[PDB]
């Protein structure tokens, strides 16, 4: 199952100044970038056009080019309309795309956040507010839902274009999507409010699923704390696993790493 996510972030500093920047993800791989400074959407993979013909891509891009300009003016007009309820600066984020399931099934979504809070989605044939959203948004929703042309275009974009485009991406991008990159590990230590803290560093692995445990022989140390997954710049992952121990208790300890890329040959590092 892969989630395709188009992420738009728009800053409005005052009546005149604004910028809109977009990134596109298929799972955890970036497929597109669209900087405010650029007239055109940039591919960040050789296969970013999917299975769309040049004419189909050109047509899709043109729709987005009109959208970006139109969006910018509409927000500025909605601010005037709700004035002085809402003032600049304003941040609007959109998260749109589809999740792909087996058997040619998918679900599409278009979620909108205002000043960092999810307030609005497109659902069915119209815009709606979601639970918790402020009441003033009822007027913008009324205005947005008057635009039958936008509703018809968005319906087609979510229902048809997104899944068709993404199915093509999954075919074209298969060998990047299914890449296996091996982790490399190393050990280190620091003090921690006392006691020592051993660190097992694991870096360069893809895809994300990984297993890392501190161990004495065959005894999995239950005090092992996995950190967050941190990205490397080359579309691999970094993770560290810590263990709090007593000074002089380090002997016997090892760090074991399981990953799909190692083909059963685990990494074992003895302190």
């Amino acid at each position, epitope marked *: 199952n892969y989630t395709f996510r188009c992420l738009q972030m728009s800053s409005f500093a005052n009546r005149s100044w604004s910028r809109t920047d977009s990134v596109v993800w298929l799972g955890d791989l970036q497929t597109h970038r669209w900087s405010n400074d650029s007239a055109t959407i940039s591919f960040t993979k050789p296969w970013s056009q999917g299975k769309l013909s040049n004419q189909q891509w050109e047509k899709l891009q043109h729709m987005f080019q009109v959208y970006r300009v139109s969006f910018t003016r509409d927000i500025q007009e909605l601010v005037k309309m709700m004035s002085p309820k809402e003032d600049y600066p304003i941040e609007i984020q959109l998260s749109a795309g589809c999740e792909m399931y087996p058997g040619n099934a998918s679900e599409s979504f278009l979620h909108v956040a205002f000043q960092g809070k999810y307030v609005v989605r497109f659902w069915g044939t119209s815009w709606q507010t979601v639970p918790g959203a402020p009441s003033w948004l009822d007027l913008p929703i009324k205005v947005l839902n*008057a635009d039958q042309g936008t509703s018809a275009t968005v319906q087609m974009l979510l229902n048809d274009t997104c899944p068709l485009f993404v199915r093509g991406l999954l075919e074209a991008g298969k060998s990047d999507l299914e890449k296996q990159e091996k982790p490399v590990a190393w050990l280190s230590s620091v003090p921690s409010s006392a006691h020592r803290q051993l660190v097992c560093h694991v870096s360069g692995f893809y895809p994300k699923p990984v297993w890392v445990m501190w161990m004495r022989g065959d005894q999995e140390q239950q005090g092992t704390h996995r950190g967050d997954f941190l990205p490397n710049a080359d579309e691999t992952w970094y993770l560290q696993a810590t263990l709090d121990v007593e000074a002089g208790e380090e002997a016997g300890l090892a760090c074991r790493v399981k990953h799909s890329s190692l083909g059963g040959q685990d990494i074992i590092l003895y302190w």
Partner: T-cell receptor
Amino acid sequence: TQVEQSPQSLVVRQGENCVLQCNYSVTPDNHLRWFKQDTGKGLVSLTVLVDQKDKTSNGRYSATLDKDAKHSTLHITATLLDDTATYICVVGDRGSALGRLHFGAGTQLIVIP
Amino acid sequence: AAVTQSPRNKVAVTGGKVTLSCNQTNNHNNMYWYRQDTGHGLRLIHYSYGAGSTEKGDIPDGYKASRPSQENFSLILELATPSQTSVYFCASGDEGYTQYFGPGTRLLVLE
């Protein structure tokens, strides 16, 4: 301007047909309206065209829109004296009140009785 | 959906104050002032999204707008000039794209 009408003016004899043109560069183009404006009077809507390729009719008036060419024509069949007026093309850039209207400068028709 | 304008015709002198009024009983949030001059399409001066709102259009200079109520939208020429000799049209609308136009006001500003 983003909306251009042709001809600027024309004179026809009663009973003759005529065709008025509207070309625009407005983007986007949600809909296009034709107005009739009699001398010293206000704007009377004749038709509104909304589809990518659209055709409408209203008695002796018929109109086409081609959004790909950004072009509309208004046809008047069997002109009458009362068709003497200015005919104005307007493009609305949104399907809502967030839209701006872009007005052409009009075509003056005179019908000789 | 009807819209009225007053006065329908006005002769004014340069430097004088002129107020053009538009009234609308449709309970429309949105009202719009335009001027029409030979050789040009209608051009937007000021508009309003409700009582207390006024917004600059494409050619606002020399005009002030006033929206005291849902019903009334005024165009005020504080210091009238001959360049403001024109036909002025008011319109109103709701969330839909249609603007419902008034019958027009003819203004002549003499020196």
